[PDB]
Symmetry: D2
């Protein structure tokens, strides 16, 4: 996959499963244009989002739905999404894994970028 997203639940020590992910690309008018979406698998991963030929150099935003994810805990999170913005392919095509460790009021987002 040129772009894969992987989500892990730091509170329970598990992959975050069946979580909705939206990816946007910044367009010329500076709006975020929908680019791809899906739900994470059993392993927390969302594969098959895009193709090389769609994944052009640009600025992309990944939004992971968190509003309801934390409900059985009893906690409403800092925001309805966990978000990270990254710049892609600005030095030639690369593959990206965006890995997110999530808690209600903290997370990390790491971009693992490899030369295909």
């Amino acid at each position: 996959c040129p772009l894969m997203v992987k989500v892990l639940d730091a509170v329970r020590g598990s992959p975050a499963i069946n979580v909705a992910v939206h990816v946007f690309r910044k367009a010329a008018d500076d709006t975020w244009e929908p680019f791809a979406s899906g739900k994470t698998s059993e392993s927390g991963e969302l594969h098959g989002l895009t193709t090389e030929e769609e994944f052009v150099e640009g600025i992309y935003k990944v939004e992971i739905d968190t509003k309801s994810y934390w409900k059985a805990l009893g906690i409403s999170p800092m925001h309805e999404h966990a978000e990270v913005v990254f710049t892609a392919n600005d030095s030639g095509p690369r593959r990206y894994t965006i890995a997110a460790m999530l808690s209600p009021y903290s997370y990390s987002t790491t971009a693992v970028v490899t030369n295909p």
Copy 2:
């Protein structure tokens, strides 16, 4: 402070000092409206961004400029900013510290919400 931003440099083990921070609020048309701005202090902290008159419930973005912060390392980072979006005051007036521990290809963040 209703909103304070603290930025640490995870590569060097130091506050991120004199880094430009921009705060925006999501507007009615779904664009980011400029809300506040400043540079971090010697301690990595940015105080005095807003007041309760102005900081109503809504969706805010903290954007920290990182494009050249890394330059001396020799690393171009994953993006020219580090961001965090949070929803405020969804249940009354609450002081927020947004803490960001930054590296070029990973960053953590915390929202600490009190009072």
Copy 3:
């Protein structure tokens, strides 16, 4: 303080308050010698652990008690402590703030080292 420890609760979005912290220094027999301890304040901070005189060059471990912190939560954490080992003052005195953002199955430990 030459050494300060600050603990944030990533699940609730708060300082972690009244949490016990232990600090050890690695002795010559390669056991961990007790060095200082305390409980964090309302800001999640623990000040006054040591003095410059006592805080000699060495390898230190900070252990933050987590076992029951996460009980009201309904979660057993990955370990009874969150722990961070660091090497101190090996290029002259420095002051250290050890900052931990904690969730039951993830945490981040950052050493902020400043030279007076």
Copy 4:
């Protein structure tokens, strides 16, 4: 694998490849007894460390060698190792992935426990 270790480099945005990992288990006299070891693969993963016959409930330390890892950075890190301690299996036989996301003066780690 009953236990897998994955190591990412947050400074460069890459798996941490060919890094040495030791795993210890706390012994009866409170010292760390060597338990397993290996080097991460090109994906930053270390498989095959143990089996259920050997991986009983207890306290384990995963130690990743970092002293010279960011020497090319020009950075001496916060300690020559990055270390995570976890209590294993404490409720029956689980599979554990220990994921470490490293910078010289910070890291983010995580135990993913599945059944």
